[PDB]
Amino acid sequence: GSLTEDGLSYKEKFVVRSYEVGSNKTATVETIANLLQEVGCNHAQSVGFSTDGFATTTTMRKLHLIWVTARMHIEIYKYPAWGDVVEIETWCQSEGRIGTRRDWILKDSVTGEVTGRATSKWVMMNQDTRRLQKVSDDVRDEYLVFCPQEPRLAFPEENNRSLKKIPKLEDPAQYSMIGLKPRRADLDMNQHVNNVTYIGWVLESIPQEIVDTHELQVITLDYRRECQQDDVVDSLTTTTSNDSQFLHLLRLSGDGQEINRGTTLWRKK
């Protein structure tokens, strides 16, 4: 992987592995999300962020701040097959005091065609109190050095899917998968649950018949609270709709505290 000629974006190629694919021998959306995180991590390191596991700027370390994900949105047109090479381009943008955004474009390395796109919103958090905050002037200034200064969006469109408000699923859910717990392979190098695990947990309550007859086209996930290493999660799903659409809710098994909400759009194979 490497920064592009202008130093304002990063590209990396990946060969899809045998264990990375599902029943149709193409990459799962979790494999795609892991690749997005990997190229994101390589881009941050290339532009001078810390290499200790928390990816921070100089001003962030001084103020004890970290980035946390608020939303992840992925749209796939074609899932790469086992053995195919996928090329992913990523870049970041400042969003004033709100937070920052990371965007991605996936391409087939052979044809050069766009096979997917993704966008993510990140918000500042004090690492000690876990309280959200605004992005300060010094952090906005740091982002000018490695982000394009004119807008560059993976999802440019007027009222596009990546910016839609997601409602809260009301009981009873049409489908559910209960007692979901993370194991050590679900944790990152800082012992926090990997953001991709939540995608897998959301998907657990989709009936197997939908997965067998449909391909996932779009997934939008809001991150509200973190699932701790000793927490237990319930994944809930209700149909809201050729195309099938679902509303999702992840909550703690005991008290029902919300951890994530999302929506998925599936198209018949």
Q: Which of residues 101-130 bind ligand A1BM3 (CB under 6 A)?
A: 102, 122
Instruction: Check residue 254 for interaction with a second copy (CB under 8 A).
Output: no
Q: Which does 119 bind (CB under 5 to 8 A by kind): ligand A1BM3, a second copy, none?
A: none
Which residues, numbered 168-187, are part of the site for a second copy (CB under 8 A)? 179-181, 183-185, 187
174 dihedral zone (left: phi>0; alpha: psi -120 to 50; beta): alpha
Does an H or E element contain 114, and which?
strand 114-126
Tokens of 137: 């002037």
- The DSSP H or E segment spanning 178 is strand 175-180
Site for a second copy contains 38 (CB under 8 A): yes
Site for a second copy in 43-72 (CB under 8 A): 53
Backbone angles phi, psi at 192, to 5 degrees: -100, 150
Closest contact distance (angstroms) between CB of 192 and ligand A1BM3 is 11
- Whichever of 129 and 190 has its CB closer to a second copy, that residue is 190
Secondary structure (3-state) at 208 = helix
* Of 141, 229, 131, 223, the residue nearest 185 (C-alpha): 229
Applying CB under 6 A, does 65 fall inside the site for ligand A1BM3? Answer: no
Q: If you search the block for the tokens 């194991």, which residue do you land on?
A: 183
As given in the structure block, the two tokens for residue 93 are: 């943008």
Which residue, 33 or 135, is less far from a second copy as judged by CB? Answer: 33
- Which residue number, 15 or 145, has a Cβ lying nearer to a second copy? 15
Q: Which does residue 80 touch among a second copy, ligand A1BM3, none (CB within 5 to 8 A, set by kind)?
A: none
Among residues 247, 264, 224, which one has the least CA distance to residue 171? 247
Residue 183: contacted member of ligand A1BM3, a second copy, none (CB under 5 to 8 Å, by partner type): a second copy
- Pick the closest to residue 122 from 52, 218, 44 (CA basis): 44
Residues whose CB falls within 8 Å of the CB of residue 71, separated by 6 or more in sequence, listed in order: 120, 121, 162, 220, 221, 222, 223
Residues 6 or more apart in contact with residue 3 via CB below 8 angstroms: 9, 10, 43, 46, 47
Q: Is 44 in the site for ligand A1BM3 (CB under 6 A)?
A: yes
By CB under 8 A, tell whether 21 contacts a second copy.
Answer: yes
Catalytic residue among 192, 195, 214, 242: 192
Return the DSSP state at 35.
Answer: H
Supply 262's token pair: 């999302």
Which part of the chain contacts ligand A1BM3 (CB under 6 A), choosing from 8-16, 33-41, 106-114, 247-255? 33-41
Q: Enumerate the active-site residues.
A: 190, 192, 227
Residues forming the site for a second copy (CB under 8 A):
17-19, 21-23, 25, 28, 30, 34, 37-38, 41-42, 53, 82, 179-181, 183-185, 187-191, 194, 196, 200-201, 203-204, 211
Residues forming the site for ligand A1BM3 (CB under 6 A):
37, 40-41, 44, 55, 67, 92, 100, 102, 122
